[model samples]
Each structure stands twice: as C-alpha cells, then as structure tokens.
Target: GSMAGEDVGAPPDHLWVHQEGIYRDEYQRTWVAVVEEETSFLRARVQQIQVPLGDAARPSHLLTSQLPLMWQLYPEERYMDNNSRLWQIQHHLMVRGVQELLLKLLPDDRSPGIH
Candidate 1:
C-alpha cells in the first residue's frame, strides 16, 4: 500500500511528456491533453481547444481571422525564414520524429490551401 497522493515516481519514457508540460492554444485558453509527442511523430488534438462560448460570442470575421498564434502560419513568417527554428527543431528529433511544424497553410488534403 502507498500513502495518499504520494509521489509515484514517473511514467514510462513514452509517457513522460504527458505527465507535465501543459500547453495552451492561441486564444490563451487553458488546455490539457492538447499535444502529444510520440517516439516518432507528434499529434495535435485540434478539436480539444475551446471555441467561441456561443454563436454570437464572436463576429463572423473572428472565425476567419488569425488572432492567436498557430503553427500553420509559422513556416512563412519571418521567424522561420530568418532563423533556424525549423531546422534546429527538426535536427533535435529522430529521423521519423518529424513535426508538421505549423504547416496549417498547406493543403495536402485540400488543394489551394497555401497562401
């Protein structure tokens, strides 16, 4: 038996990241279980993020506007071009551990999605 709420050491290597490092979406909405990094690939749970509280809570343009930070637009931004964020981040992961890396603007599933 163990004490109540006692430390249980840590989860396995694959599950270590899930134990900590809570992330937030662009609107600053607190979110848990949003992103999951696997041994090879990282999966982002987009549906988890909270949307407008109500139908009229936001304007129509708000739905189409990019008010918050996102990975989809990062590739073309000055940061990606002037700095080595992608290259460095890519180098840090395993060959198979590639990140979609804010490829939101790309349309692999739908054509003409790119700007």
Candidate 2:
C-alpha cells in the first residue's frame, strides 16, 4: 500500500493495494475492473475490470461488483489473493430481500397479483 500513504477509507481503485497475491500485500492493489486503451487502425478499444465475489466461504473477501469485467486476473504484478472462486452473485443467493417480505411471500408462491 505504498500509495496508501495516509488515505483512510481508501476507494477501491487500480492504484490501491492488493493486500494479498504473491506480493503479500506489499504492492498497491485495486480490487476492481480494468479499462484497457484503444489500438490499431480500426481503433479497437478494449477495457477490462475485476468484479469481486461475496459468499460465506470468504468472509474477508467481498464480491466487489455484480458484473463481469473481461478475463480475470490482476493486471498488476501483485498476486490475486487466491480468493475462493465460489460465489453467489445477484441471483445466486439462497436468501435475499427483507425477511418480512420473504415470509409474506412464503406459503404463497404467487405474489399479490398471482393466485
């Protein structure tokens, strides 16, 4: 976290410290998506970023985003922290929404509009 000189509540960015990976939290890692630049006559612009995962398996690790950011792997030299790939994204959660809403919707698979 060299760049993390004195910044508290550091906003996850490309210049942030990885805190894991092979470098062992020595380098600044950004747990986020990457946006590549353009190239060639066609002017093909390619961007990439990493969407973290959140699940019971890794309490320390969080699923940074709810979308995919191209191929995976930290662009920087730092390690990937080897976080558990297993995750329950958006629709992957067994339990979501307010408990009251779930309870209300229970027994009656149909919503207010359904029979």
Candidate 3:
C-alpha cells in the first residue's frame, strides 16, 4: 500500500526565532521582521515583502534584501551600543502603531533604558 506523502524539510532561518505578522502601514504597504535574541543582545532581520505592481500583467521583479539591524538589551552598560540603523527602523515601526515589537519578544524583566 502506498502512503500519503507528508514531507517535512528543514525550516527557514527566519522561522527559527520570534516574529510578528505582516503589518500594513498607512500607505497600505506591507512590512515584516524576524527577531532573534542572543544572551543580552538582540537583532532583527527586516524585509519589505511586497511587489509594487502598476499593472496586473508584469509585476516588478527585484531582489528583496533583509535588513539585519542590531541593538542592545542594556544600553546603560556603556559597552552594548545600538546600531543607528536599528533606531531608524524603530522610528518607522513606531509610527506604524507596532512600536517596540522587539521588546515584546523579550523577557518581562527587560525594559527600555533601565537595565
């Protein structure tokens, strides 16, 4: 008897960490990210996951590169500095009503500016 095919392959790198659902901004564009944590440090791999198509037939084909931004859990320590790119991305997410999504993924003891 032939069995039903049920293949389970290795999961993608993004799926290995905490992530939020797709967020649509005021302009109706979509954005998403996959956040990873390491010890006292954190980082996110962000990407714009949509193609801007002016017509139905031919959609723009372009490579979507992931933005790997890093930040520290304890900035007061003076050694754990945050990336400027991270702040810029945070500002955009803040305006989109999903600010501090990274903080949400962290432990309850973690907070902003108080380590």
| Number of the top-ranking candidate, with lDDT as the measure | 3
Q: Write the per-residue lDDT of candidate 2 for residues 1-115, one digit (tens) a residue.
A: 2223333232222222232210111122223322222221111111112334232242222343111221122322121222212111111111121010000111212223322
lDDT of 2 at 41: 11
Compute each candidate's TM-score over C-alphas. 0.21, 0.15, 0.27
Could you give the candidate ranking by lDDT, starting with the highest?
3, 1, 2
The runs of at least 3 residues in candidate 3 whose Cα sits more than 4 Å from the true structure, single-residue gaps closed, are 1-20, 51-115
Q: Give the alpha-carbon lDDT of every model.
A: 0.24, 0.20, 0.30
- What candidate 2 gets wrong by more than 4 Å, as runs, is 1-30, 40-115
Over 48-106, each residue of candidate 1 has an lDDT whose tens digit, in order, gives 23333322333422342221122222322211211122211221111131112211111
Least well predicted 10-residue stretch by lDDT in candidate 3: 58-67
RMSD versus native structure for model 1: 15.8
lDDT score of model 1?
Answer: 0.24
Roughly what TM-score does model 2 have, to 2 decimal places?
0.15
Q: Once model 1 is optimally superposed onto the true structure by TM-score, how far is the C-alpha of residue 114 displaced, in angstroms? A: 35
* Stronger candidate by TM-score (1 vs 3): 3
Better of 2 and 3 by TM-score: 3
lDDT score for residue 38 of model 2: 21
